[PDB]
Amino acid sequence: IPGMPTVIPPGLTREQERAYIVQLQIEDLTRKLRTGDLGIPPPSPEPIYNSEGKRLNTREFRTRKKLEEERHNLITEMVALNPDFKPPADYKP
C-alpha cells in the first residue's frame, strides 16, 4: 500500500489550485514546528559545539531549522501567487 493521497478539491481555478496545495503545506509545516519532537528520525555531518561542549547541530536542530526555512519560502511563494494573502505576524519578507 503506497499510502493515503492528498486530494485537491474540484471546481477550483488553476491559480486557486496552486494556492490550495501551498496553503496546505504551510499548515503542515507549522503543525510540525508547533508539535512533536523533531529529534525523532526522519545523513550525519560533522558535529558542532559551543564553548561548553554542548552540541549545536543535531537532528532536532537541523530539521527544525530546515522546516522553518521551507515554511518561509512557501509563504513567499504564496504572496507571489495570492496578492490578497497576508503573511503571518512572525513572517519577515
Swiss-Prot record:
<feature type="region of interest" description="Disordered">
    <location>
        <begin position="33"/>
        <end position="56"/>
    </location>
</feature>
<comment type="function">
    <text>Necessary for the ATP-dependent first step of spliceosome assembly. Binds to the intron branch point sequence (BPS) 5'-UACUAAC-3' of the pre-mRNA. May act as transcription repressor.</text>
</comment>
<comment type="similarity">
    <text>Belongs to the BBP/SF1 family.</text>
</comment>
<feature type="modified residue" description="Phosphotyrosine">
    <location>
        <position position="49"/>
    </location>
</feature>
<comment type="subunit">
    <text>Binds U2AF2. Interacts with U1 snRNA. Binds EWSR1, FUS and TAF15. Interacts with RBM17.</text>
</comment>
<feature type="modified residue" description="Phosphoserine">
    <location>
        <position position="44"/>
    </location>
</feature>
<protein>
    <recommendedName>
        <fullName>Splicing factor 1</fullName>
    </recommendedName>
</protein>
<feature type="modified residue" description="Phosphoserine">
    <location>
        <position position="51"/>
    </location>
</feature>
